[PDB]
Structures are given as structure tokens and as C-alpha cells.
Write a protein that binds this ligand. Sequence first.
Ligand SMILES: Nc1ncnc2c1ncn2[C@@H]1O[C@H](C[C@@H](N)CC[C@H](N)C(=O)O)[C@@H](O)[C@H]1O
Length: 199
Amino acid sequence: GAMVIRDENYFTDKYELTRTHSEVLEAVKVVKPGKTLDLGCGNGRNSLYLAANGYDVDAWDKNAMSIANVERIKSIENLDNLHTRVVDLNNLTFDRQYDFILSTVVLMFLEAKTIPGLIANMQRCTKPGGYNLIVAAMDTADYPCTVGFPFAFKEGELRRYYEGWERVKYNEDVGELHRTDANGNRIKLRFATMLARKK
Ligand SMILES: Nc1ncnc2c1ncn2[C@@H]1O[C@H](C[C@@H](N)CC[C@H](N)C(=O)O)[C@@H](O)[C@H]1O
């Protein structure tokens, strides 16, 4: 009989994908299966894990090839509850209500002028009791952006956006990019990480 567990190794070991994001794995201990939106899904590590575990996933990205790859894997695995779209997040408005919206390591790639409108759109489209998970690069006095991302959160800025939500988790811890500097050392930067629940 076919083994039903779909853990953080499943898509990782079968389709050469990076392991499911640590914050997605944590989030699901708290966030129950529901209508989900993965904004900038890439090659789908997070959308695929979610859909395989009962979440109804809208998985969106600008990269047509990345979307094709998600669709390829979706077809192989019969993930009926995973739906894809090639979208430009800089030029996008949406209107469906969701239990869970996540954007993991995507927002720093967007135009700075997109962010206020997108975050407001995210909050608008979360159900009361629903959750938003965001992880994104920052640019701070102690950890300046050395990559030149077109956007990065300032210290305290993500928290300010989500005033009035319950911040189940919020930190601006120093992390590392995978890309390296002139001496081959991983680039150190703070990331804003938040799991927040709407009242
Ligand atoms: N303007 C844009 N609209 C939609 N997606 C974008 C845009 N700019 C960058 N992206 C996507 O952001 C993704 C960033 C990747 N690091 C994948 C993040 C993915 N959420 C993950 O946790 O693996 C890429 O797949 C890009 O195609």
C-alpha cells in the first residue's frame, strides 16, 4: 500500500526541492488546514507540502518555468487541491478570503512602492481568526543591505504593519543568505519573521 505521510523530506527527496521552510513547518502546528494563498511560491516547496497535508492552496509566482514545475509535480502526485497562477505581485489585486496567507523570502524582490498596497490587500483578504506568515530581508543600521534588494523592511516596520493582530511569533533575527560575499562568507542580514493572527 502507498505510504500516506507527507513530511518535510517528501518533495525534497523526490523532486530536488529545498526542504520546506522552517517557519511553514512551525506555522502548521498552530494553523489548521484551510484556504491558503502562497504569494511567490517558487518551485512550490511550501505549496506542495501544504496541499499534500489538506490545505487548499492558490500558488502564485512571476516565473512561468517555476509554475510549470509546480504543475508537473502536481500532476504526478494528483494534488487536486493545489491551483497555480503566473502573476506579477507588483501589478496585482486579489479579492478572495483566506484562512492563511504566506509570503516566505519573496517581498524583498518586489518594488518598494508595491509593499504598502500588497500588505493591506493581504490583511483585507484574511478571515477573522486567519493567519499571515511573512519572512523577508531587512536593511538596518547594524545589518545594512549589501545585496541591493529593491525592497527590505526597516527595523520595526513589519510589526508596525500588523498592529492590532496577535503576533503569535515576531522577530528580526540575524540570518544568512545562501549567496556569499567577496571572501565566500554567507551574507549576514536581519530577517523580519512574523506569524500573526487577525482578530
Ligand atoms: N514581481 C513578482 N511577482 C511574483 N513573484 C515574484 C516576483 N518577483 C519575484 N518573485 C518570486 O519570488 C520567489 C522568491 C524565491 N526565493 C522563492 C520563495 C518561496 N516562497 C520559497 O519559500 O521557497 C521567486 O520564485 C520569484 O519568481
